[PDB]
Design a protein around this ligand. Structure first.
Ligand code: NI
Ligand code: NI
Lengths: 142, 142
């Protein structure tokens, strides 16, 4: 039951979240391994990538491994550039999303609880990509 | 309450565990930040380092960032060399320790629960460094 795996031996899968662009995940340590309280996932956002800003009743603990990206913070009216070696705590309920420009790629770890109630979008739409069109979202990027 | 910190802005402190050698930790995300279920710590084992092999009723999830070290596995009679990009799940109760030779340095993340009952040593002694003297420990190293 001790598990050792190299990141490259865990398949990178496209994330399921509707409206995410250019984003994959590798479930490095997960419940089938015997994790029963928290899990470890490696995300990678390739150039021109983004996730819809959202919030949820479960905290994030993040460590940026390689590259750089924007941490979109709707309740702070802006986007924070993050880079290697940064640790980020996002408390339950704080809105957040991720973005990369042409040219940027970022790989980062996310620690999550095993219990993860549904996420709520900051921007509500039937087309889950519409946030990229919205002035209230682009204003956060600049 | 969102926290962003670079690793170099979190002080590296010597670990408290008696008999550990050349090992520090940086508490990157911890309970004063608002983490209330799991925490994120960066360990670094400098050359000629080690920790006393132990076991405990709390799992480890590890990601090796830089360098290499031995993961000592007393119940498997050996030591596994680990290196960058490896994810390691150590279930509750599995004995484990860390070692570096002359020449090796390793930096790795550990995710831990906030509740952490006391560790138990594999090798019992009054001098907490005595494990490095013991044939049953050196046999694991080779
Ligand atoms: Ni999230
Ligand atoms: Ni331990």
């Amino acid at each position: 039951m001790m598990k050792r795996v190299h990141r490259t031996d865990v398949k990178a899968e496209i994330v399921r979240e509707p409206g995410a662009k250019e984003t994959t995940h590798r479930k490095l340590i997960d419940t089938p391994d015997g994790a029963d309280r928290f899990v470890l996932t490696e995300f990678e956002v390739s150039p021109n990538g983004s996730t819809p800003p959202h919030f949820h009743e479960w905290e994030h603990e993040i460590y940026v491994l390689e590259g750089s990206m924007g941490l979109v913070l709707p309740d702070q009216g802006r986007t924070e550039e993050v880079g290697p070696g940064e640790a980020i705590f996002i408390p339950r309920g704080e809105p957040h999303g991720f973005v990369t420009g042409p040219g940027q790629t970022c790989r980062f770890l996310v620690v999550a609880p095993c219990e993860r109630p549904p996420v709520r979008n900051v921007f509500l739409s039937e087309d889950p990509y519409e946030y990229t069109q919205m002035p209230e979202y682009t204003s956060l990027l600049e």
